[PDB]
Amino acid sequence: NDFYDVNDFFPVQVDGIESSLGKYEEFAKDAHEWESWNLQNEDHPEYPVKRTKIRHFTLNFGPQHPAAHGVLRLILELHGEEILRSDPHVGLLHRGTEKLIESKTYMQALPYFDRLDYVSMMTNEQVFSLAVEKLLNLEVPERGQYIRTLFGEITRVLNHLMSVLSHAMDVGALTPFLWGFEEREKLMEFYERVSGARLHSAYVRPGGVSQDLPAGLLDDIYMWATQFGDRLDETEELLTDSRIWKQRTIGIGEVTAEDALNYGLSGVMLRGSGVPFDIRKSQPYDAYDKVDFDIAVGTKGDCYDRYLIRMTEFRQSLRIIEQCCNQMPPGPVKVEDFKVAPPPRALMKEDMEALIHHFLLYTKGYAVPAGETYTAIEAPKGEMAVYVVSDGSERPYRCKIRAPGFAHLGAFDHIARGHFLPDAVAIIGTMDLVFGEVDR
Amino acid sequence: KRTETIDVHDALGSNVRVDTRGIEVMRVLPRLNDEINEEWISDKTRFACDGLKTQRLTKPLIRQGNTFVDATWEEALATIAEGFQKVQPKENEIKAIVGSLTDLESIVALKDLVNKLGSENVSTDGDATTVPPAHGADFRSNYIFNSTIDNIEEADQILLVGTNPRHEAAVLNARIRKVWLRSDLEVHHVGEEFDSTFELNHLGSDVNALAKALTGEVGKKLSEASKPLIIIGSGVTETQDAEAVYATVAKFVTSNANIVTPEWNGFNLLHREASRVGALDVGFTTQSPEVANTKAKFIYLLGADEIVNKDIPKDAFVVYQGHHGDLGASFADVILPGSAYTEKTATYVNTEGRVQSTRAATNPPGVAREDWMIIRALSEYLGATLPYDNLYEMRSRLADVAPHLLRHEVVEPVSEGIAKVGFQSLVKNPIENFYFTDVISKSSPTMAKCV
Amino acid sequence: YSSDLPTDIPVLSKRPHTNLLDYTFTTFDKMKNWARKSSFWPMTFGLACCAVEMMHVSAPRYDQDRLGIIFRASPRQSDIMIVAGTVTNKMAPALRQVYDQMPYPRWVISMGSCANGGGYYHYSYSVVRGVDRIVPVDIYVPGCPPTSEALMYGVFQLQKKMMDGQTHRMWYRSY
Amino acid sequence: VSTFPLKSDINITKSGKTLLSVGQGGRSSRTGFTATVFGGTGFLGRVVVSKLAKHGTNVVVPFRNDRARRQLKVNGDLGVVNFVEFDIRNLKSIEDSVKYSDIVINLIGTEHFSKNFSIEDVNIGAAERIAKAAKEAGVSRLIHVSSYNANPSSSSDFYATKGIGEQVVRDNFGPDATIVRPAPMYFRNSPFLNELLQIKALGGNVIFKKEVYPVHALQVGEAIERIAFDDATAGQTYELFGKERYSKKELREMIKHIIHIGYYPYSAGFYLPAPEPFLYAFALIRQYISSQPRFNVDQLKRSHINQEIDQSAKTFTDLGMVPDELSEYLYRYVKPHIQNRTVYSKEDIEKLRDYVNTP
Amino acid sequence: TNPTAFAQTTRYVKDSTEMRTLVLNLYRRYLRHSRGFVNNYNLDIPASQVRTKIRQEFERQRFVKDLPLKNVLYMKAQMEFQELVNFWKQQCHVMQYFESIKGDSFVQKFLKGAQ
Amino acid sequence: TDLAKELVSGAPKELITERVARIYQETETWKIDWDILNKGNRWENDLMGYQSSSDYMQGTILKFDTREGAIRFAKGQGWDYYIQEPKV
Ligand SMILES: NC(=O)C1=CN([C@@H]2O[C@H](COP(=O)(O)OP(=O)(O)OC[C@H]3O[C@@H](n4cnc5c(N)ncnc54)[C@H](OP(=O)(O)O)[C@@H]3O)[C@@H](O)[C@H]2O)C=CC1
Ligand SMILES: CCCCCCCCCCCC(=O)OC[C@H](COP(=O)(O)OCC[N+](C)(C)C)OC(=O)CCCCCCCCCCC
Ligand code: SF4
């Protein structure tokens, strides 16, 4: 039952027990003291053993753990050191973003998306910008889509540095964490020069970007590109061929390609299992068709494979950054429609038509024609998509966000079952969890 | 934030839209209603909004000497009862006066409190020389616009019985002017001389001018009119010859048959207060000159201001309940703050008999309560507790008063088979300053620029 | 009984040292506060996007370790608690359990908008509107997210407060 | 508490100020008062301050310890809880906490004299200065807390000074002042209980033979709250105590039995029979060698004096509150210090109490 | 994937009688864990008190009529059982669950402000 | 309509009884909002003049499509309500 619980040899009929001084029944009322007179052997499988159900050691991999990328009450049920069942408790960071967007305009709802994933900002707001652009039936000009491709790559480098190095740090390699974080400081300079804030760059707005690139940014972006090429090499020096790094990750968290599709995994934990699918290729967008790059596909579906794919994503992203700097076109950076973009300040105070649209954009907002859409992009974690329903109003009606880290954490039970408690950290690290995105 | 409610300055009760901001009303705009106003409101209504931001009574007040002091509700509801039995008023020594802006829920609920203490010196703050109203609260048709507003554009002859429609109902004044342009409209002036947007078939200034009207060509066209109009302003009952007015006219309404058809009623009233019709539809008026002569020892004012000609005894106990500090407030002894018309759900009745309520916009300022809620609160302090414990029950009481009181935005008329029986009962411009008419206008800083 | 309390004797934070004991117990306070001023060990309570900045202080560009700052995971080993990120209702009971386990002395720093007064999610059905409803706070760092220097500035101001502690002189003069 | 503490939304104080409360009684509501709670950082203050702030009354809490005032600000909203640094020897700082105050509460009271203050200087000298200074600033109401056995002629220093504290206030603040006498309160970290839970309690037989009338500290916390919002309760004397009579020795064995503390009580030091001169000598010696407030000579005398109810005063029911018994709350407050937990319910305390009295 | 302790499939029951028996077993399950809820959450109320409150909870809403709304009330009550037995709610929430809770005349409500 | 759905919506007990919802029409669709509270709807904060409020339904408006659709909803939730007919 709920609180406690209760054959090969032949069932042998023995009756008529006798001793040398009488029968079994003659001394029955006295033999309980005589331990050598008992008739219930203790080796019998049918012997009544009633033992209380003492629950197994359930350690809380709870919020106050450095391995956690947020506040995760990972209720782990373990016997010994193996993993029996895992039940993550997401929601400790449910800020209710989906509820708040319904009451704010399409321009005011953009800064919510930078706060989903703390590290992949300009990719997050790109998927809402594309969603609104798809409904608005307006297309960003060429130079706008090249800026989104360049900062699409820089964001991927920023995200993967947080993902790979913390995964390396959580294993125990402290040094590669600090070498890479200087590069993030160097990369966050580029975010701050174009947008103003280091981390949450409300830059990619529906209808292009916020402001044109500052002069000389390309020179500084390219100069970092030459130096950055060595940074991966030293990262691959202390991780790629080290035997301790291989032992911690090889064969840890095996995910079949057929089973990865079943749980809807996307991103690195779908090419780690061998499927050569990539959203940047399946649905080209924002000047990704123009550039050329090679996708990476694993063969064993374990953490070490996903590491190699993520490291390859560094060089392939750096490959595009060279192409985006070289192939940069001239022109505007946002759609030249005053109804979906603020007019320049030189013209707002000179032209009566310009001032009216500036006044009207910021008080009522632009109205999105009715419809519904589901646009998915290759986020650094995986397939990130938003389901947006337009009710002809200047405020979206329904905004459901597909978080790649949300689905992956669900497949923790399928992946981590049968591994050891140290392998739990490796599995979490390779999932690239950011519980702001999980609990959107 | 917008709310749809009604004006209380005049007796039209036109539909308006109020745009508030938190706990302050910013502007009032008209909301379309072809039945009453149709996009027009006078400058008085829309520029008296700021009158609710000053002079407000926010606390109970108690007189100690000759200056009011800030006192709680516990003491205020007791100082009335404490001094109530110090003087021990008799049956006719208790008086109640209801103001122009007092809502109908307080008007009905006050009678129950008054009756359980045995008094009948209750009426409005008018100056009707005849102690019972000349038209009388007996029948609805005696004091209502039986035509209603939507039955003016199809009239031929209109009689102004001592009135200034420009200064008495601006919305309807232009309605007559709009008809007067294209139609063959004929309007004759019988009353004090004035200045109008349009000329009239002017006669004179005396009552004896009307004596030769209904029998000459002035009244012959009234017989000729398929839909003739007779209008009696709020300035008639005040006059000395108010009794002569109804007998003279209703004799002309009981004579012809084209005046009163199954589709038309040629006789109407044009009051100017938003509480007179509500009073008459509930019988909140006296019916004896002797009772109006009593030197009452306890006069309980409920929104009443125009009481200068009302003989308030100096030794009497005067309690004023309202939402402003004005003429009626000085006479008080213990003041109970009420509620502004926008701050309450008050059921009002206009001069055409239409029952229009209000939707609450803001909370009452300070620690003010609802108008009637004080009376029931005051009831427990006098042993005359009323059985009404929520606003629905106050409307439940209105069900016993009449069936039309519970029909929102629905007008119950007087049937042609009975309104003629009510006709059988019968057989100087009242307003000085246009911008000083009601309590809110007098305290409005804006109207200080209209003088 | 006999009692006579003066009136011009000043408050502790304004009272100058007069005798030699007032210099002895000021030495103990500075020496003891200098230990806590330098060995400033917060707790890694990163919750949301504000947590990225708290990592970048440890990054080689700023290197919190140079100032004697070594984050300690366990509350027992940590004398500070930098509450960074949104504090949801589902977390608030847990946050109080973590705070109450810090041995005295203990300080709390509220970094970012969410920890201060609600921030972006102030009108959310499941967001505590300011962590000050749950734990006392000694310094508020404003930002979204506060720059890595803004947190260091907030750390420095709290350090300047700790160096103003006068506990062992308080026993001598105010107790 | 419930939902809104004020009896009426508008309350006029003795000074003519007309205070209007707003809101439905939440954290973001207000009451328009300003209750300066002297000694708010103490055991009793943290209950007095907490109740006043949550209902919207501004609290000005004068403190002398900087690190103890931080936790008092959680209770109120922004600007509700204010702080003033002060000392009883700094008159100017006293007048900073009463300038805007409509309610002044006095909780300052000590049992041990220090190298800076005597028992009189605090229960009188602080109280006299606080009360007289509050009057000069037009404070409408004063509330005071004294001992439960105040007596001007008592040989105990605490009771003698606390009694004179009642007189000196009424000669300074005037007829408006109120005096409230609380019985030994029991709550989390209550000084009344902290002596009973201590394992090494020298002179345990002598100290614990005293008698008391224990009262729940929450009710006394609300008792001041009820008095604060009412002007009808000026110039009174209130003694607050619990119905069922308990003695420390009855409690000490009752406390120990819940914690299940054979040989251990005889060895760890639960019962330490020591000579009366030794107890008197030990307290005197520590009085010059200790640095933290220890057992005092005064509490050696108080152990011989039992609690006395004064009939001139008024009980809880005068305020409309029924006092709660130690039986319904004694277990939970020692639950921190205690297979299957046995919860000693309200009635079962007697059955525990029965087991103590049986020889 | 392996479902957690004390889990049941979400099923739309299409019988009036079966739902009656499902509830009855459920009420016993709460009473069986009466001792645990006291020891797990360290509640101040003894075991008999919890059963008294549980009975007050089950007695309260026994008169519902809609079967489509019977399953919903049985589904969510199952979650309350699963959350409580698995020791998921924090200590504070259970303490406040049992710590929740006659009106006043019109004069009393008129004076202070009513609602 | 006959269903006591209020036991599954999780709404507080006060919505069923002490609140009134208006079904109005601002010009092609209908809306539902709750009438303001008697007291405590809006009090001026004494610190910074913020428009405080205890009513949690002040900011809620539901955009409907047809009148009978709105009435169906109000009966489904067990909401007290009244209907305001627009002027022609
Ligand atoms: N159940 C109980 O606790 C008992 C209640 N009482 C009496 O009730 C009253 C409330 O005191 P209580 O809170 O319970 O216990 P505490 O001793 O902890 O209260 C002392 C309060 O007064 C302050 N205080 C003491 N001396 C000074 C001083 N020279 N200068 C400034 N402040 C001083 C303290 O400041 P700080 O703490 O910040 O240093 C503290 O705020 C006391 O008089 C107490 O004797 C009677 C018997 C027992
Ligand atoms: C044996 C035990 C182990 C070793 C003990 C020593 C541990 C470290 C001590 C830290 C001291 C500290 O922190 O002193 C530095 C602090 C920091 O200045 P501040 O806090 O801003 O105040 C100072 C400014 N005022 C006072 C105007 C506000 O004060 C001082 O400048 C103290 C004054 C300098 C003292 C120099 C003379 C004494 C020399 C003694 C050594 C021979
Ligand atoms: S304050 Fe801004 S950066 Fe910090 S947690 Fe909140 S949303 Fe993120």
Automatic annotation (TrEMBL), chain A:
One of its GO terms (molecular function) is oxidoreductase activity, acting on NAD(P)H. Keywords: NAD, Oxidoreductase, Translocase, Transport, Ubiquinone. The gene is nucm. Gene3D superfamilies: Cytochrome-c3 Hydrogenase, chain B (1.10.645.10). Its EC number is 1.6.5.3. This is NUCM (49 kDa) subunit of mitochondrial NADH:ubiquinone oxidoreductase (Complex I). PANTHER family: NADH DEHYDROGENASE [UBIQUINONE] IRON-SULFUR PROTEIN 2, MITOCHONDRIAL, NADH-UBIQUINONE OXIDOREDUCTASE 49 KDA SUBUNIT. One of its GO terms (biological process) is mitochondrial electron transport, NADH to ubiquinone. It comes from the Eukaryota.
Automatic annotation (TrEMBL), chain B:
Signal peptide: none annotated. Residues 1-56 form the 4Fe-4S Mo/W bis-MGD-type domain. Its cofactor is [4Fe-4S] cluster; [2Fe-2S] cluster. One of its GO terms (cellular component) is membrane. One of its GO terms (molecular function) is 4 iron, 4 sulfur cluster binding. One of its GO terms (biological process) is ATP synthesis coupled electron transport. The keyword Metal-binding applies. It comes from the Eukaryota. Keywords: 4Fe-4S, Iron, Iron-sulfur, Metal-binding, NAD, Oxidoreductase, Translocase, Ubiquinone. Belongs to the complex I 75 kDa subunit family. This is NADH-ubiquinone oxidoreductase 78 kDa subunit, mitochondrial. It comes from Komagataella pastoris. The gene is nuam. The chain holds residues 243 to 704 of 726 of the full protein.
From TrEMBL, chain D:
Residues 39-184 form the NAD(P)-binding domain. It comes from the Eukaryota. Pfam families: NAD_binding_10. Its EC number is 1.6.5.3. SUPFAM superfamilies: NAD(P)-binding Rossmann-fold domains (SSF51735). One of its GO terms (cellular component) is mitochondrion. Keywords: Oxidoreductase, Ubiquinone. It is an enzyme of class 1 (oxidoreductase). GO terms for molecular function: oxidoreductase activity; protein-containing complex binding. This is NUEM (39 kDa) subunit of mitochondrial NADH:ubiquinone oxidoreductase (Complex I).
UniProtKB/TrEMBL annotation, chain F:
It comes from the Eukaryota. Its main location: mitochondrion. The keyword Mitochondrion applies. Keywords: Electron transport, Membrane, Mitochondrion, Mitochondrion inner membrane, Oxidoreductase, Respiratory chain, Transit peptide, Transport, Ubiquinone. It is found in: Mitochondrion inner membrane. GO terms for molecular function: oxidoreductase activity. It is a peripheral membrane protein. GO terms for cellular component: mitochondrial inner membrane. GO terms for biological process: electron transport chain. Accessory subunit of the mitochondrial membrane respiratory chain NADH dehydrogenase (Complex I), that is believed not to be involved in catalysis. Complex I functions in the transfer of electrons from NADH to the respiratory chain. The immediate electron acceptor for the enzyme is believed to be ubiquinone. Belongs to the complex I NDUFS4 subunit family. This is NADH dehydrogenase [ubiquinone] iron-sulfur protein 4, mitochondrial. It comes from Komagataella pastoris (Yeast).
